């Protein structure tokens, strides 16, 4: 029997595994080491969670290797691999309320949003990639013939093997799902390291793989520290690919580690400072609604969040007035209250960074219009914040807050190339957006923006079929869409003479 | 007017540029520094070549950046970019004898081979990729609609920008062409670092880009050292991708440097220890001819060379006997002489390694059947070598010679999985081959071999349309074929709401 | 509430609808006209089925048009269309025993085969194409730019609209599923005409679309005659595409009718006379098993059945002896009995044709080795038959039997091109096969065979992912695979200047 | 030595073949039959041209069949087929002034336009498709495995064989080139029937195939009548595919003939009545320029010409005034004169139809604003024409003029869905257009338009890389782009068990 932490909450009795998941079983870490996971709504300890050690990483990688090389997963038809992944999505759907509640408790995700996005999109991801399994195809190629003989050349798409995936804490289940679905659909096996601060939905997910009948060792989950677990995964001689999502600085380190061990493949989904350009010829009330969402969605803990808004001079003051009006209407509180719009920040150290970020913004001369502070109440709540009079040289015009902080600059009426230059003057390149009713401006701006995703007259519109990844120091490689599969496949060329 | 080293040779008058090529002009390096390039047929100095410095790398990158951002290359139609690359191929064709002669002098490539392969395949590479320019396409994707509104999602394929490419010395022009053609077809601009020991066809190529009308700064060429030029390219904040071909150990360093600077993209085409499995049921005389070619082609300086031959017990002794007869018929000599079929090794340091390699082979207990030594004559000639009684634990069963050394092991009659296990017991995974008349065996073996390319009843059958790249510590990414374009493109997702 | 014909059989209760299915309801035909459907196991009447009239065709097309233009099917996300088709496959699976039993009663399909193939592959088909819905993608194309302006060109894949599909009787549910799954996945609506002699699984399928929640009018089913119902579908001005499977002569008429009405798109999956070439170097015992399967599978009522076997002279006599021995072992009888492996022919007129076919074979001088007659028991059973000494000019060498009749010719030892000529001497080109252990022969023969499918060392190996269709007078267009979708999609090119 | 009609015009000496082109030679038709080709600028006879008979069609098809089955074209590498097609494009470019002059004499094409489009796009078409030859690729497919055995399934793309193509007279060389280039790139051989009235560029093209070294019999050209030559091509037992461009009514007959003979594949590029919707929020002066182009380009002999303009009420009168001002500036004259804007109609019978068309427009009650008449000068010139107050029930609202007649209707301010319904109320669906600055309207309207091509803020923007084809009674199949290749290829599925 699996040991659970039991909790009666949100009309449910949650049953939460808290141990490492290796080779299809929940097990204590070496020396039974544990750590505390903290509820951000009140700062209380949810439970103790196993703290993976090096020997545990080695056990997990060994179980993944055996599952890949000798287990059922490497033998079944691609179509049957698809069936299992569809079934996993069904099991996740059957537990969707429980998963969303766990995400509310562990990450501070507003429950209504967690149902639809954190969990709903996770389900869509497994279903989408389940469909790809038997539709991954190689080629036959019309090469030059070695006359008087003949040649046939074909390519085969094959799995890469044992993969390690390292996940951040902002959407714990969803970020896990994005990478894991594509990885498994391609026929690989995996060791997953969730962010230390948010292990619980990953562990519940591990249990669901058992209910779905995923063969033992195909999925292994190791809560613990990046500097220990993530490091060993990146160094391991039997891991052939790392999928990493997190900060640019840690990304650099991970890629270095892959290089120095066995030149394992790596994908890097790193930070952003994404610009949103709002022209005077946009629908203004819609621009305010979408502009607010671009910043405040999931309490700003959103890698594609608009980190600068450029607003055309003639509409700037009305835009800011409408924003302040809307911001005052936002309900801050417990993620389980059904009218909550704004939940708490994910953990204490992040809240403190946001406090300092805003002090720095004021110190360097930006205008704090509203917010800027921790909300006085238990837990780790931060006020929705608006800065104006932001200039291009400022720290807050360059650095990603990863919090609910709207950072506004004017641009001159009738200018286009000049605002584009400013929007592109970052080493990041993850996302961007443009609001305008003018088809010509919309198309030109989307061409010129140096970012992996461009939203036109919307924001935060990701989709499991639409590839997602950054340019420049936001990294490389895609999650989602057909393109995600390529990170997890290798191509073998086979050439016959006959 | 360009400064040339003039040489009357092979019934031609060679005109060889010898300077750095930056922003469409031939220039001396900082401080007029130079180094000598050596003719491997007699060990003499061909000429002095400019020795690129750090300031020269920065100039080249700046010229590439300007050509990309502001020059004609970034403005013209993809179709017209194609026309220029085709014209480049035509200019190379018009200079084919001259290019093949330069490759004979600089790399010791046998002239008849250089004409057909080194140069002939380079021409095919530019023509093939010229065809791809206006056929690189993105997608429109059926995402979920934000009802009552509608959504359109498309992807755009865009160039990555300024690329650095670092090339080895075994097929100087061909290896340059593989990477450069795909890079340029994708709309990028490039800084190329040829191997220090083989700069001359690259510099002549640079002049041919002028004749073809390639805009200034699109192609820049920096002869010099890897530890200086290559390092600065991998470190440079304006370079966005490195394409690297060379040793696994240098590959590890390159990738690390990419990580620590600006997480530039990297492709790695590294070493191999490729197995060739010869079954008793093959066509024996053909297996001898193709087995010969798998080792001795281009004096063994061939990344896909068979590094181990596994021969079935019942035909082993007859195979070895027939190989020896054919080895004895090989004419060793000056690459410009028409009856030469074995030219000299590329440079002195490589010759020294081959000598040491065979010393270690004999020391550890392998049977040296013939060769193993430098040929007594001027230059850097190495006697075609055959080892038998090679056991799996031996150094020469594990390490890549990159020379004309056939390394033969036996396997028991009727065994298949046992010989596959041995063939796959390497950290490399570049190429492999199987000779057999049995359809079932050929298909099963090609499935089970852990290599990026599998040859069936042939060897060394590369084609510009067929992708080429390794698994495991042989690296990642493809040269050739449609797949090669992906390394040099980025995908932007554009999502509208309307 | 739906009216059923109820029957207790095969350890279940069959509930069979027997009326037309139009706009989501079961309804009598005009004038309450009906016809009898006949059980081929005993010659008895299963039940009366509604006989669709021209006015019923018009009602069905109108319901399909309305469902497409104004109903939910034309409004929902592609992903949600996928969900509904996956639910339909689930519902089919829940009713798999019932469906397979109906197929045994209506078509004479051996129940164990029907469960695995007739029904099992139908379920796979819906699941395969359900996965395609949100993976059907258009392109973005790098066209020449009208400088100083810019251009964006994309393609959109759109449904064709109302489709008519006309099905033969050999695999009633399976043939329906092949076409219907691809058609619906592409977002079309459909009017289906099952063969008059086999309406029952189509009508049960109709009921299952209600259980799955497929919107009204998306699927319409019209049992009746081709000369009436099929004709009107091909003539109808609101039908935009016809998918036809059947004889070559009816296909000609269908295509003509499409031309003369509104140039509706058409696919034709027509007859075949498929050659199987068996070389002396094959595995003989396996060649007998697979050779028998190529002819006798599904009592020979199989469009891809091998219609001629060419057997190398040196193994001919031993092959024929072994076939005769295995034929004697076949259990002919009631398709619901578990030991049965040869069921009755589909209907009486077909049995009569087979009797006449074999009489003609004997008259023209072929050696009847075994079979040739009706089996002396109730229903329409025909003996598994073997002819030898078949010459190229013979009627039975040219005409498709569509029954369990093995038609054997010799070819000289060592001939390859000579037998290929004879194998290709037909205006048909549906399938073909070759048995040999020789890799060079297999690859060469598969190149040279003029047929849409070539099996190598197997036969009857169809798969929902592998496209299926003929060449020459076997028609054009594919069922199955990604390729099938193109028959049911139209491409809209959209070009912007900005 | 080829017989020519020599003519000194346009500062060149034209050398025009005038005979049938069969199996690499120019030959007289049976009984030395001829007909006159007429210059539309003055009505004079240019020369006598061979008049192909049935026996001549049989000779051409035989030559094409021999070239495909036994000639060099079926033996060479795909890459070398590409080389020949690129050489063909080069030869066409070397003769571009001569070809453009012939097109001016034969078709009345304004010379400056013929250089850029009639000939310029023809050259681009051959270069584009030349690049496809070695990039046409099949697939490897992950089918279910027949355990304990394994399966490999691949597809091969193969040529269809002998094709017949039937061309109209509006862009004689360009229409020939569209179809011929894709057909030959796919590896087929061809018999071409140019429109009887415009045979000369086709015959000159034939001679250029000799200069380019295209093997004899690969291209055969038969000037003559459709009811004889075209009919026999559609009926021929050795022809496997017909590519037809022309009227809907002849298309119907063509498809019927394909049906009744050997179910040869057919593509149909038929008529159009393409709508152009102009919103009040467009750029008006640009809308006038592009609106005029949409009608008057190539004297209106343009299958995608806007056959109706719907103009928003508030801008209608100003739009009409501006069009009138600009029409008065058009220079009507000899197509060889550099100042000519508007050349003569293609032939006399077509001119007479246009006169009758405009009489009927006035009779039925539309307002004739300008033009409507034959210009008073020699040859077959027609005045650029503008109708307003066109109602939906009028003949000129339904029928394709195929001449320079702008047919304008109003729609109410704000009335998007209503104008769409009117624009879609046709059985044609070839092209369409929308002018608006509003991104929402542009995207919504392009979704809703029932046409194969939608232009947004432009018109007549075709490109060799963008597929072109209609919906509904405008036919099916694409010319141009990757999609065109599928009409000229067949897919063979090869499935191994091992
Ligand atoms: N290539 C493939 O995928 C494939 C698969 C299965 C079978 N087949 C071929 O099908 C043939 C066996 O079936 P069959 O001989 O019974 O075929 P068939 O006579 O051509 O009938 C096929 C269907 O067409 C209908 N039909 C007849 N006349 C029509 C008309 N004028 N307009 C529209 N529809 C009309 C028939 O209706 P009724 O019910 O009234 O007869 C039946 O539903 C064999 O040659 C076999 O190879 C091919």
Same-domain pairing of A449 and A315:
yes
* Binding site membership of C278 for ligand 1 (Cβ less than 6 Å): no
C251 CA from centroid of ligand 1 (Å): 8
Percentages helix, strand, coil for chain A (3-state, rounded to 5) are: 40, 25, 35
Solved using: X-ray
Name the residue among B86, B464, B498 with its Cβ closest to that of D439: B498
Name the residue among C141, C253, C259 with its Cβ closest to that of D255: C259
Specify if A350 maps to a domain. yes
Question: Measured between alpha carbons, how far is residue A107 from residues A40, A93, A118, D210 in Å?
Answer: 7, 20, 10, 74
- The 8 Å CB, 24+ separation contacts for B382-387 are B382/B299, B382/B344, B382/B345, B382/B351, B382/B354, B382/B355, B383/B332, B384/B296, B384/B327, B384/B330, B384/B332, B384/B342, B385/B358, B386/B320, B386/B323, B386/B324, B386/B327, B387/B358, B387/B361
> For residue D456, how far is the Cα from the chain centroid?
21
Place of tokens 């004689």: D172
Same-domain pairing of A333 and A474:
no
Chain D CB contacts of B137 under 8 Å are 482
Chain D CB contacts of C139 under 8 Å are 482
B434 CA from centroid of ligand 1 (Å): 47
Chain B CB contacts of A457 under 8 Å are 496-498
Classify residue C477 as left (phi > 0), alpha (psi -120 to 50) or beta: left
- Ligand 1 site-directed mutation target among C109, C250, C402, C480, most atoms within 8 Å of CB: C250
Q: Which residues contact B112 (CB under 8 A, 6 or more apart)?
A: B338
Residues in chain B: 498
Q: What is the CA radius of gyration of chain A?
A: 24
Specify if C354 maps to a domain. yes
For the beta carbon of residue C77, count every other beta carbon within 10 angstroms. Answer: 17
Q: Which residues contact A280 (CB under 8 A, 6 or more apart)?
A: A312, A313, A314, A315, A413
Same-domain pairing of C78 and C144:
yes
**Running DSSP on this structure, what letter comes out for residue A281?**
T
Q: Beta strand D385-388 with D367-370: parallel, antiparallel or unpaired?
A: antiparallel
Which of A330, A463, A454, A349 is closest to A402 using CA atoms? A349
Instruction: Measure the CA–CA gap between A426 and A101, rounded to whole angstroms.
Output: 37
Are A466 and B253 inside 8 Å of each other by CB? no
Q: Contact at 8 Å (CB) between D446 and B155? A: no
Q: For residue D300, give how far its alpha carbon lies from the nearest alpha carbon of chain C (Å).
A: 21
Are B496 and D439 inside 8 Å of each other by CB? yes
Question: Measured between alpha carbons, how far is residue A421 from residues A275, A411, A417, C53, C498 in Å?
Answer: 11, 11, 6, 69, 20
What tokens were used for C398?
A: 């040219």
Instruction: Measure the CA–CA gap between A17 and A205, rounded to whole angstroms.
Output: 9
Question: What CATH number did the domain enclosing B106 receive?
Answer: 3.40.605.10
Q: How large is the greatest C-alpha to C-alpha distance in chain C, in angstroms?
A: 84
* Binding site membership of C245 for ligand 1 (Cβ less than 6 Å): yes
Q: Beta strand B25-27 with B20-22: parallel, antiparallel or unpaired?
A: antiparallel
* Binding site membership of C253 for ligand 1 (Cβ less than 6 Å): yes
Q: How large is the greatest C-alpha to C-alpha distance in chain A, in angstroms?
A: 84
Helices (H), C14-77: 54-69
Q: Which residues contact D89 (CB under 8 A, 6 or more apart)?
A: D123, D126, D127, D130
Q: For residue C254, give how far its alpha carbon lies from the nearest alpha carbon of chain A (Å).
A: 33
D481 CA from centroid of ligand 1 (Å): 35
**Running DSSP on this structure, what letter comes out for residue B421?**
H
Specify if D1 maps to a domain. no
Are C134 and A150 inside 8 Å of each other by CB? no
Instruction: Measure the CA–CA gap between D382 and D398, rounded to whole angstroms.
Output: 21
Could you tell me how many helices (H) and strands (E) chain C has, helices first? Answer: 15, 22
Same-domain pairing of D206 and D241:
yes
Encode D252-295 in three state secondary structure.
HHHHHHHHHHHCCEEEEECCCCEEEEECCCCCHHHHHHHHHHHH
**Running DSSP on this structure, what letter comes out for residue B332?**
B
Encode A376-392 in three state secondary structure.
CCCCCCECCEEEECCCC
Residues in chain A: 498
**Running DSSP on this structure, what letter comes out for residue B438?**
B
For the beta carbon of residue D184, count every other beta carbon within 10 angstroms. Answer: 27
Ligand 1 atom nearest the C-alpha of C253 is 31
Q: D262: burial class by Cβ within 10 Å (0-12, 13-18, 19+)?
A: middle
What tokens were used for A199?
A: 């292990």
For A463, the 3-state DSSP assignment is: coil
Which of C30, C17, C16 is closest to C60 using CA atoms? C30
Q: Which residues contact D176 (CB under 8 A, 6 or more apart)?
A: D122, D165, D167, D192, D194, D201, D202, D205
D243 CA from centroid of ligand 1 (Å): 27
B115 CA from centroid of ligand 1 (Å): 60
Q: For residue A439, give how far its alpha carbon lies from the nearest alpha carbon of chain C (Å).
A: 8
Specify if C1 maps to a domain. no
CB burial string A25-46: b at 16+ within 10 A, e below: ebeebeeeebbebbbbbeeeeb
Place of tokens 């491409």: C491
Same-domain pairing of A158 and A34:
yes
- Phi, psi dihedral angles at D344 (to 5 degrees): -75, 160
What tokens were used for A325?
A: 């009006």
Name the residue among A453, A493, A497 with its Cβ closest to that of B453: A493
Same-domain pairing of D393 and D487:
no
Q: Contact at 8 Å (CB) between A484 and A243? A: no
* Binding site membership of C349 for ligand 1 (Cβ less than 6 Å): no
**Running DSSP on this structure, what letter comes out for residue C474?**
G
- Ligand 1 site-directed mutation target among C226, C259, C427, most atoms within 8 Å of CB: C226
Q: Which residues contact C67 (CB under 8 A, 6 or more apart)?
A: C23, C73, C74, C189, C215, C216, C217, C218
Specify if C189 maps to a domain. yes
Cα end-to-end distance, chain D, whole Å: 58
Same-domain pairing of C471 and C455:
no
Instruction: Measure the CA–CA gap between B60 and B21, rounded to whole angstroms.
Output: 8
For B168, the 3-state DSSP assignment is: coil
| Discontinuities in chain B (C→N > 2.5 Å), after residue | none
B161 CA from centroid of ligand 1 (Å): 58
Instruction: Measure the CA–CA gap between C200 and C172, rounded to whole angstroms.
Output: 9
Specify if C424 maps to a domain. yes
Percentages helix, strand, coil for chain C (3-state, rounded to 5) are: 40, 25, 35
Chain D CB contacts of A154 under 8 Å are 140, 154
Cα end-to-end distance, chain A, whole Å: 59
Chain D CB contacts of C262 under 8 Å are 427, 472-473
For the beta carbon of residue D186, count every other beta carbon within 10 angstroms. Answer: 26
Instruction: Measure the CA–CA gap between D99 and D201, rounded to whole angstroms.
Output: 6
Nearest chain D residue to A79 by CA distance is D144
List the domain range (segments joined by +) for residue C264: 6-271+464-498
Q: Contact at 8 Å (CB) between C245 and C195? A: no
Are B469 and A491 inside 8 Å of each other by CB? yes
Ligand 1, atom 45: nearest CA belongs to which residue?
A: C271
Nearest chain A residue to C481 by CA distance is A135
Chain A CB contacts of D138 under 8 Å are 139-140
Encode chain D in three state secondary structure.
CCCCEEEEECCEEEEECCCEEECCEEECCHHHCEEEEECCCCCCEEEEEECCCHHHHHHHHHHHHHHHHCCHHHCCCHHHHHHHHHHHHHHHHHCHHHHHHHHHHHHCCCHHHHHHHHHHHHHHHHHHHHHHHHHCCEEEECCCCCCCCCEEEEEEEEECCEEEEECCCCCHHHHHHHHHHHHHHCCCEEEEECCCCCCHHHHHHHHHHHHHCCCCCCEEECCCCHHHHHHHHHHCCCCCEEEEECCHHHHHHHHHHHHHHHCCEEEEECCCCEEEEECCCCCHHHHHHHHHHHHHHHHHCCCCCEEEEEEEHHHHHHHHHHHHHHHCCCCECCCCCCCCCECCCCCHHHHHHHHHHHHHHHHCCCEEEECCCECCCCCCCECCEEEECCCCCCHHHHCCCCCCEEEEEEECCCCHHHHHHHHHCCCCCCEEEEECCEHHHHHHHHHHCCCCEEEECCCCCCCCCCCECCCHHHEECCECCHHHHHHHEEEEEEEEEC
CB burial string D10-35: b at 16+ within 10 A, e below: beeebbbbbbbbbbbebeebeeeebb
Q: Which residues contact C370 (CB under 8 A, 6 or more apart)?
A: C324, C327, C383, C384, C385, C386
Instruction: Kindly provide the residue ranges of all beta strands, DSSP E only, lying in B109-237, ordered along the sequence.
Output: 138-141, 151-159, 162-166, 189-193, 219-221
Instruction: Measure the CA–CA gap between A302 and A459, rounded to whole angstroms.
Output: 12
Domain total for chain A? 2
Which residues pair with residue D7 across a beta bridge? D14
Are D457 and A442 inside 8 Å of each other by CB? no
Chain C CB contacts of A124 under 8 Å are 79
Instruction: Measure the CA–CA gap between C444 and C421, rounded to whole angstroms.
Output: 13
C225 CA from centroid of ligand 1 (Å): 11
Q: C422: burial class by Cβ within 10 Å (0-12, 13-18, 19+)?
A: middle
Instruction: Measure the CA–CA gap between C398 and C392, rounded to whole angstroms.
Output: 8
DSSP B23-87: TTEEEPPGGG-EEEEE-TTT--EEEEEE---HHHHHHHHHHHHHHHHTSGGGTS-HHHHHHHHHH
Ligand 1, atom 29: nearest CA belongs to which residue?
A: C226
CB burial string C212-222: b at 16+ within 10 A, e below: bebbbbbbbbb
- Phi, psi dihedral angles at D450 (to 5 degrees): -90, 65
Ligand 1, atom 2: nearest CA belongs to which residue?
A: C269
Nearest chain B residue to A160 by CA distance is B471
Q: Contact at 8 Å (CB) between B412 and B313? A: yes
The residues of C whose Cβ lies within 8 A of any Cβ of B are 77-80, 133-134, 136-145, 154-157, 436-440, 442, 456-457
Place of tokens 């074909």: A154
- The 8 Å CB, 24+ separation contacts for B248-254 are B248/A263, B248/B428, B248/B473, B248/B474, B248/B475, B250/B226, B251/A263, B251/B475, B252/A259, B252/A260, B252/A263, B253/A259, B254/B166, B254/B230
Q: For residue D235, give how far its alpha carbon lies from the nearest alpha carbon of chain B (Å).
A: 36
Instruction: Measure the CA–CA gap between A264 and A162, rounded to whole angstroms.
Output: 10
Encode B221-256 in three state secondary structure.
ECCCCHHHHHHHHHHCCCCCEEEEECCHHHHHHHHH
What tokens were used for A492?
A: 């073998």
Q: How many CA atoms lie within 13 A of A193 on its CB side?
A: 29
Q: How large is the greatest C-alpha to C-alpha distance in chain D, in angstroms?
A: 84
Q: Which residues contact A474 (CB under 8 A, 6 or more apart)?
A: A248, A269, A270, A271, A272, A428, A429, A430, A451, A452
Q: Which chains are within 8 Å of B by 3+ CB pairs?
A: A, C, D
Same-domain pairing of B109 and B37:
yes
Q: Contact at 8 Å (CB) between A68 and A159? A: yes
For A226, the 3-state DSSP assignment is: helix
Instruction: Measure the CA–CA gap between D227 and D52, rounded to whole angstroms.
Output: 11
Cis bond upstream, residue C340 (ω within 30): no
What tokens were used for A135?
A: 């539709």
Instruction: Measure the CA–CA gap between C467 and C481, rounded to whole angstroms.
Output: 5
Q: Contact at 8 Å (CB) between C369 and C65? A: no
> For residue B289, how far is the Cα from the chain centroid?
23
For B416, the 3-state DSSP assignment is: coil
Specify if D282 maps to a domain. yes
Question: Measured between alpha carbons, how far is residue C474 from residues A196, D264, D323, D472 in Å?
Answer: 63, 10, 55, 26
Which of B272, B331, B311 is closest to B472 using CA atoms? B272
Q: Contact at 8 Å (CB) between D361 and D375? A: no
What tokens were used for C210?
A: 């209600």
Same-domain pairing of C257 and C301:
no
Which residues pair with residue A494 across a beta bridge? A154, B454
Which residues pair with residue D268 across a beta bridge? D244, D476
DSSP B451-482: SSEEEES-SS---TTS-B--SGGGEE--BSTT
Ligand 1, atom 5: nearest CA belongs to which residue?
A: C303
Chain B CB contacts of C141 under 8 Å are 137
Chain B CB contacts of D131 under 8 Å are 82, 130-132, 134-135
Question: What CATH number did the domain enclosing C415 receive?
Answer: 3.40.309.10
- Phi, psi dihedral angles at C343 (to 5 degrees): -90, -175
Same-domain pairing of D480 and D338:
no
DSSP C131-167: HHGGG--EEEE-PPP-TTS-EEEEEEEEE--EEEEE-
Instruction: Measure the CA–CA gap between B383 and B366, rounded to whole angstroms.
Output: 17
Nearest chain B residue to D497 by CA distance is B440
Same-domain pairing of B228 and B281:
no
Are B137 and C134 inside 8 Å of each other by CB? no
The residues of B whose Cβ lies within 8 A of any Cβ of C are 77-80, 133-145, 154-157, 436-440, 442, 456-457
Specify if A211 maps to a domain. yes
Ligand 1, atom 38: nearest CA belongs to which residue?
A: C226
Same-domain pairing of D259 and D344:
no
* Binding site membership of C477 for ligand 1 (Cβ less than 6 Å): no
Q: Contact at 8 Å (CB) between A275 and A310? A: yes
Are A444 and C86 inside 8 Å of each other by CB? no
Instruction: Measure the CA–CA gap between A109 and A106, rounded to whole angstroms.
Output: 8
């Amino acid at each position: 029997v699996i040991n659970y932490v039991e909790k009666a909450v949100n009309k449910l009795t949650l049953q939460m595994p808290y141990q490492l998941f290796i080779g299809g079983e929940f097990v204590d870490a070496e020396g039974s080491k544990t750590y505390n996971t903290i509820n951000p709504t009140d700062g209380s300890v949810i439970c103790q969670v196993s703290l993976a050690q090096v020997s545990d990483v080695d056990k997990a990688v060994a179980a993944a290797k055996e599952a890949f090389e000798n287990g059922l997963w490497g033998k079944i038809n691609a179509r049957d691999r698809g069936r299992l992944l569809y079934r996993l999505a069904d099991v996740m759907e059957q537990h969707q309320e429980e998963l969303a509640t766990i995400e509310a408790l562990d990450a501070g995700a507003v429950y209504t949003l967690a149902l639809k996005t954190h969990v709903g999109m996770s389900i869509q991801t497994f279903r989408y990639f389940a469909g790809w399994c038997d539709k991954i195809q190689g080629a036959t190629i019309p090469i030059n013939q070695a006359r008087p003989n003949r040649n046939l050349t074909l390519t085969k798409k094959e799995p890469v093997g044992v993969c390690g995936i390292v996940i951040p804490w902002n959407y714990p289940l969803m970020m896990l799902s994005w990478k894991t679905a594509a990885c498994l659909a391609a026929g690989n096996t995996v060791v997953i390291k969730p962010a230390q601060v948010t292990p619980l939905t990953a562990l519940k997910f591990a249990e669901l793989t058992l209910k779905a009948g995923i063969p033992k060792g195909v999925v292994n989950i190791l809560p613990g520290s990046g500097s220990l677990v993530g490091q060993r995964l990146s160094d391991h001689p039997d891991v052939r690919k790392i999928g990493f999502t997190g900060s640019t600085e840690v990304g650099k380190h991970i890629m270095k580690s892959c290089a120095l061990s066995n030149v394992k493949k790596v994908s890097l989904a790193l930070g952003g400072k994404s610009p949103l350009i709002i022209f005077a010829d946009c629908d203004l009330n819609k621009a305010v609604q979408m502009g607010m969402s671009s910043v405040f969605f999931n309490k700003g803990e959103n890698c594609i969040a608009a980190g600068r808004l450029f607003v055309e001079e003639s509409i700037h003051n009305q835009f800011v007035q409408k924003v302040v009006e809307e911001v005052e209407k936002m309900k801050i509180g417990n993620p389980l209250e059904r009218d909550t719009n704004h939940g708490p920040q994910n953990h204490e150290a992040h809240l403190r960074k946001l406090v300092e970020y805003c002090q720095r913004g004021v110190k360097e001369g930006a205008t704090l219009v509203c917010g800027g502070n921790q909300v006085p109440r238990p837990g780790f709540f931060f006020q929705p914040t608006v800065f104006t009079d932001v200039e291009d040289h400022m720290y807050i015009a360059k650095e990603e807050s990863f919090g609910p902080i709207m950072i506004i600059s004017r641009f001159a009426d009738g200018d286009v190339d000049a605002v584009l230059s400013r929007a592109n003057a970052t080493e990041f390149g993850l996302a961007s957006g443009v609001f305008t009713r003018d088809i010509n401006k919309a198309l030109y701006v989307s061409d010129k923006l140096q970012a992996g995703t461009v939203f036109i007259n919307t924001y935060n519109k990701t989709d499991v079929a639409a590839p997602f990844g950054g340019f420049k120091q936001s990294g490389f490689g895609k999650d989602l869409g057909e393109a995600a599969l390529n990170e997890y496949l290798r191509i073998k060329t086979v050439t016959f003479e006959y």
